Amino acid sequence: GMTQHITRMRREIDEIPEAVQRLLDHGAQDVARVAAVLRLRDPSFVATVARGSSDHVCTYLSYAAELLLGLPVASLGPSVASVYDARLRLDRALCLAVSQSGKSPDIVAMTRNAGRDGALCVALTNDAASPLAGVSAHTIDIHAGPELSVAATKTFVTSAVAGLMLLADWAEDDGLRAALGNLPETLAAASRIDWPEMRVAIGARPSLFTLGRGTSLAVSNEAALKFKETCQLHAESYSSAEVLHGPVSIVEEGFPVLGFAAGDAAEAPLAEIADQIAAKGATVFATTGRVTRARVLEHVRSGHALTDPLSLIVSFYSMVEAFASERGIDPD
Amino acid sequence: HITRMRREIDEIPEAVQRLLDHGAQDVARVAAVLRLRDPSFVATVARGSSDHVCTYLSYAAELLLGLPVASLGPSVASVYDARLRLDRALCLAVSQSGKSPDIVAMTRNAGRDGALCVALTNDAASPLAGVSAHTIDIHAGPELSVAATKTFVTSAVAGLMLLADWAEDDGLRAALGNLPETLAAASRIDWPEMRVAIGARPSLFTLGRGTSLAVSNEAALKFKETCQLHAESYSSAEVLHGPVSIVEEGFPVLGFAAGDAAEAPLAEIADQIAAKGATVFATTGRVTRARVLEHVRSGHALTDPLSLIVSFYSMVEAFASERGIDPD
Numbered sequence: 138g139m140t141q142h143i144t145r146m147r148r149e150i151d152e153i154p155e156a157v158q159r160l161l162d163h164g165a166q167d168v169a170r171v172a173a174v175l176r177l178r179d180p181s182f183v184a185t186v187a188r189g190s191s192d193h194v195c196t197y198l199s200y201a202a203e204l205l206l207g208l209p210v211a212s213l214g215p216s217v218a219s220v221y222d223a224r225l226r227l228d229r230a231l232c233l234a235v236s237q238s239g240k241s242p243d244i245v246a247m248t249r250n251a252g253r254d255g256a257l258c259v260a261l262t263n264d265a266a267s268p269l270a271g272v273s274a275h276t277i278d279i280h281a282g283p284e285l286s287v288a289a290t291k292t293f294v295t296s297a298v299a300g301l302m303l304l305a306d307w308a309e310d311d312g313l314r315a316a317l318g319n320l321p322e323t324l325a326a327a328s329r330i331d332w333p334e335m336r337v338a339i340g341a342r343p344s345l346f347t348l349g350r351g352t353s354l355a356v357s358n359e360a361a362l363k364f365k366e367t368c369q370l371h372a373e374s375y376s377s378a379e380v381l382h383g384p385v386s387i388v389e390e391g392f393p394v395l396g397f398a399a400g401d402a403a404e405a406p407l408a409e410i411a412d413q414i415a416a417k418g419a420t421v422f423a424t425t426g427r428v429t430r431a432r433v434l435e436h437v438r439s440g441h442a443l444t445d446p447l448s449l450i451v452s453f454y455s456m457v458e459a460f461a462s463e464r465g466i467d468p469d
Numbered sequence: 470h471i472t473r474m475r476r477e478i479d480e481i482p483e484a485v486q487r488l489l490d491h492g493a494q495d496v497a498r499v500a501a502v503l504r505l506r507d508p509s510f511v512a513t514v515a516r517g518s519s520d521h522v523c524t525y526l527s528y529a530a531e532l533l534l535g536l537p538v539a540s541l542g543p544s545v546a547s548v549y550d551a552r553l554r555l556d557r558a559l560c561l562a563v564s565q566s567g568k569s570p571d572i573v574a575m576t577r578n579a580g581r582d583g584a585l586c587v588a589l590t591n592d593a594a595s596p597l598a599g600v601s602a603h604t605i606d607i608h609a610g611p612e613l614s615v616a617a618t619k620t621f622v623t624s625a626v627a628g629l630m631l632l633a634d635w636a637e638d639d640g641l642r643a644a645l646g647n648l649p650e651t652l653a654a655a656s657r658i659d660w661p662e663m664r665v666a667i668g669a670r671p672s673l674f675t676l677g678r679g680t681s682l683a684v685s686n687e688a689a690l691k692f693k694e695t696c697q698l699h700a701e702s703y704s705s706a707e708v709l710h711g712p713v714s715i716v717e718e719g720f721p722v723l724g725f726a727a728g729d730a731a732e733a734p735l736a737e738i739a740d741q742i743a744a745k746g747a748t749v750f751a752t753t754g755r756v757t758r759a760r761v762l763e764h765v766r767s768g769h770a771l772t773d774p775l776s777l778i779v780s781f782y783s784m785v786e787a788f789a790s791e792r793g794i795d796p797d
């Protein structure tokens with residue numbers, strides 16, 4: 138009938154592909170200009186400033202910068218500025234600040250101090266007129282549009298895409314630029330996956346372990362965050378290289394395990410651990426054809442190692458929304 | 470009949486004294502190298518509890534020396550074998566055994582790529598030592614318990630000694646020098662009221678702000694490892710904004726506050742949470758709603774967290790032994 142029965146979370150997941158398209162179209166110029174400044178200034182290291190889901194974006198971008206450009210990336214605790222007002226040596230540094238609204242006093246303070254202390258500050262934000270924009274040398278509008286879902290899926294995806302576009306223009310990497318260019322298609326496909334077998338597993342045992350290795354650890358961390366946020370159920374993210382050596386036995390917990398595998402150098406080791414876990418009797422799923430014991434999760438590859446995780450997180454978001462809506466949990 | 474964990478905690482003060490006695494020359498040598506090298510940044514390489522030590526040392530280096538500190542994901546070397554730009558950097562690797570192939574690989578590659586690699590380890594003959602330019606033996610000695618309490622304290626102390634000598638910081642050196650006395654005092658505290666709260670509602674939330682977040686993180690880890698009960702560590706500036714309501718969970722909250730600029734904001738958030746009905750304890754006499762936890766100050770802001778974590782280890786050991794939990 139006339140009453141619509143689509144959650145805000147789902148509405149925003151179905152807007153992710155076009156949001157990325159708007160960022161690719163409308164943000165291309167600003168991104169190219171900042172990349173030109175970076176090639177000229179030629180900084181020798183990167184500092185990131187962020188909190189919450191924005192910090193998972195920063196983790197993603199830290200792997201991307203290190204793998205593409207070889208630049209070491211330091212995550213700066215905002216208290217260094219906001220509590221201690223320490224003087225840092227940031228000449229020759231890019232400071233990358235990531236924040237949906239750009240209002241957080243701590244993020245603004247750290248970004249302001251970074252500039253004072255020599256860094257070229259670039260903000261990735263959904264509000265170009267925010268306080269953060271005002272303390273940065275450059276602002277890249279992520280073109281996420283208004284978020285009404287607490288999942289804030291558009292903000293995560295577009296933040297990461299904005300940072301990847303910058304890195305790709307800075308590195309002058311045509312393979313990555315091509316993959317980025319095709320993301321709306323890839324993400325559209327990814328949003329049509331909702332992993333019914335995982336939803337049944339979680340319904341049976343309602344907590345979740347996520348795994349990542351290398352770059353995909355950033356989306357594994359994001360996935361655990363948003364699962365807690367939207368479903369009010371417990372989740373924990375681990376490196377697949379550390380999961381078998383932590384405080385608690387993952388297998389003894391009896392909860393489903395989801396391995397985030399991108400088509401990169403970490404795909405094989407992730408698959409290997411996923412299978413080892415499944416061989417102990419645990420319920421394990423992984424986003425790769427390489428697993429022989431763990432269950433293969435439907436996924437869409439992107440054309441490049443660094444864009445692959447964005448496709449996986451879109452599929453995850455879609456799984457979580459379906460899980461919640463069919464159980465009468467409106468995330469919002 | 471004391472537990473191995475209690476015996477381990479009791480050994481902490483002497484272990485720190487041996488580090489001061491037998492590690493001072495090695496630390497002074499490396500500090501002299503660094504002081505003249507004047508690296509523009511620091512990278513850290515660690516996993517598990519050693520990564521909490523790295524967090525602690527990251528804050529210490531930023532606040533003392535103004536150098537930004539980058540935590541390097543070991544897969545960058547072990548999986549991707551990426552070429553990094555680490556010219557002139559200090560790369561600090563922290564590992565009890567120094568055997569982890571990922572830690573060894575990231576450190577080896579850090580050196581390959583220009584960093585001066587310094588290992589803080591309990592085994593000077595380990596593979597990690599073998600790929601480092603300098604090795605500082607932490608003098609932790611054998612781990613007696615899964616809590617691995619000496620390893621954490623001595624690793625941090627070794628890092629702090631290095632930073633204090635590099636910075637030529639008399640006040641920090643003084644505090645470090647008195648650590649065995651401070652930590653002996655700290656080990657005699659076991660927070661009985663906290664144990665009652667945790668017994669009643671057996672999960673724990675720990676908080677820190679700035680430097681003390683390192684020990685907050687360590688605390689949650691070791692509570693989980695020793696007791697097999699859930700714990701999670703948050704920045705006090707973020708705890709009221711996370712995906713799950715801390716007050717609504719109904720579990721005790723432990724605020725770690727050092728005698729630094731973060732003490733007041735930690736105490737304020739601790740009181741806000743307490744004002745909402747949660748059971749909150751904090752290591753500061755500045756809270757007026759949350760309960761004050763007995764604690765020993767050390768003579769320097771940067772050494773204060775080591776006192777707090779020793780008291781915490783003592784509380785956990787008492788909590789576990791009383792309830793029939795044998796961590797070991």
Ligand SMILES: [Cl-]
Pocket residue numbers: 188191235236237238239240241244
């Ligand atoms: Cl923010």
Ligand SMILES: [Cl-]
Pocket residue numbers: 349350351354376377378542544
């Ligand atoms: Cl990893």
Ligand SMILES: [Cl-]
Pocket residue numbers: 516519563564565566567568569572
């Ligand atoms: Cl290790």
Ligand SMILES: [Cl-]
Pocket residue numbers: 659660661662663762763
């Ligand atoms: Cl008490």
Ligand SMILES: [Cl-]
Pocket residue numbers: 214216677678679682704705706
């Ligand atoms: Cl903090």
